Amino acid sequence: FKNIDGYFKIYSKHTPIDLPQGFSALEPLVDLPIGINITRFQ
């Protein structure tokens, strides 16, 4: 999750298998023109 230049960007990746080894890039999923201020999440 990133928030830059008034845009919210979400990248995602899924895999069927403590964190595993190996390399696997994440592909872009969604961009949103929301333009708010973000400081905390849950």
Next chain:
Amino acid sequence: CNGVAGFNCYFPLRSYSFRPTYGVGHQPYRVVVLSFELLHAPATVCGP
């Protein structure tokens, strides 16, 4: 006026009672107003 009509107590509404028999400059006009915003913004709405 204790919530009742009377002298100096007028209901602030008035009816139109539109009829097809009025003059040309008397029938109701259907009006719309479109307002834009020319500023720096994400610019969600844009033309074809």
